Amino acid sequence: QTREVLDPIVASLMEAQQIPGMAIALVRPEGTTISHYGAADRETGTPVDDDTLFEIGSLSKTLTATLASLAEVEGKLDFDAPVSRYLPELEGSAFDDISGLNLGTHTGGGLPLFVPDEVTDRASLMAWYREWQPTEPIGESRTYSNLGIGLLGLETAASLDGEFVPTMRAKVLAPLGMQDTWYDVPEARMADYAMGEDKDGQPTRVSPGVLDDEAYGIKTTAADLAKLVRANLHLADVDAELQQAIDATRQGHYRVGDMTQALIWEQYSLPVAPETLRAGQGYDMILEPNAAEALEPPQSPRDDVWVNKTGSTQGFGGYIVMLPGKHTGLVMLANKNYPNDARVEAAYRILSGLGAIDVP
């Protein structure tokens, strides 16, 4: 069925990229199919199964965006308000001029990609933010940023008067049934935690760091991520306010060349050429500032787009695609950090093989 389309493509991908193991969820009206392939740990040979936890890296940012949006729906967070309204410890800094929306769209004045080495804890982070000078025009330039989405997580937690992880668990993960999603893998689930494999074929596992939870720290299953995808596709039964929060994450906020930046989610109008998708995952988009043009008609979520997000760690590579117009979504998790171009190709081939897209 689905599996006759999916299986050969996955086999071929895993051989070409030497990926030890994958977990794949396909979400459609009719239901969700979960598929597991290969080994959770190349060394031990333990097979990937329903309980296997993968590092999803920057896919975590989709949850951060979702909680931020829920705080907004509840009236606790104003997305266009200055960040310093909610983190008064930043009053007088550039965060008087940068909003939560800027942070969720990577338009926060050139805020850099990585947490600097000199930042080692919350106190040193906040002092770094206080001193930092914007290098790009706020709201007019996109620079993909862990610091930015991390600060949105801090802003959101403050607006909700809660700690980020337990608040995420209670307000987003639990209501979505995401019970195999972890920021810190419990000791009792360590046997289920896949071992990563880096580009050099060496075992690797992510280390804690500043803003890890907010930016890149989730370990989860494909099935759990599929619940988030299901809700984004209007295929879940969830709380009205949570559904509203989720839908708002797909509002288009900035045009960035061919790409539309929503709240973390990135999207393209259909039909889309794979080369366009590849360009979205390349050096020029990810590692340079790109001019960004605000959409203040904030675009209502669209039904004729390819919505996506990549995420990686040193040892893992994930990709989510949604096609809201076809009520179809795809989650691909691997315990190898394999090239984004191959993620794009595999996803396109799967979705086209399933009839959810046309090629030429």
Applying CB under 5 A, the residues found at the interface with Cs ion are 179
Lookup result for tokens 């989860």: 220
How far is the CA of 198 from the CAs of 206, 219, 316, in angstroms? 11, 17, 7
| Cα–Cα dist 78/99, whole Å | 9
How many residues bind Ca ion (CB under 5 A)? The answer is 5
- In the bound complex, what is the minimum distance in angstroms from residue 233's beta carbon to Cs ion? 23
Which of 213, 219, 263, 310: binder of Ca ion (CB under 5 A)? 213
Query: What string marks each residue from 62 to 81 as x (binds Ca ion by CB under 5 A) or -?
Result: ----------------x-x-
Under rule CB under 5 A, residue 117 binds Ca ion: yes
For Cs ion, the closer of residues 35 and 179 by Cβ is: 179
Lookup result for tokens 């729906």: 73
Closest CA to 107 of 84, 83, 88, 71: 83
Specify the stretch interacting with Ca ion by CB under 5 A; choose among 155-163, 166-174, 209-217, 235-243.
209-217
Under rule CB under 5 A, residue 341 binds Ca ion: no
Q: Of these partners, Cs ion, Ca ion, none, which one is at the site of residue 80 (CB under 5 to 8 Å by kind)?
A: Ca ion
Active site residue 58: yes
- In the bound complex, what is the minimum distance in angstroms from residue 243's beta carbon to Cs ion? 21
Q: Is the dihedral of CA 248, 254, 255, 260 positive or negative?
A: negative
Span between the terminal Cα atoms of the chain, in Å: 24
Q: Which residues of 86-120 are buried (b: 16+ CB within 10 A; e: fewer)?
A: bbebbeebbbeebbbbbbbbbbbbbbeeebeeebe
Helices 61-73 and 240-248: crossing angle in degrees, nearest 10, is: 120
Residue 96, annotated as binding a ligand: no
Active site residue 300: no
Residue 97, annotated as binding a ligand: no
Q: Which residues carry a binding-site annotation for Ca(2+)?
A: 51, 78, 80, 117, 192, 212-213, 284, 288, 345
Q: Which residues carry a binding-site annotation?
A: 51, 78, 80, 117, 192, 212-213, 284, 288, 345
- Residues near Ca ion (CB under 5 A): 78, 80, 117, 212-213
Residues noted as catalytic: 58, 144
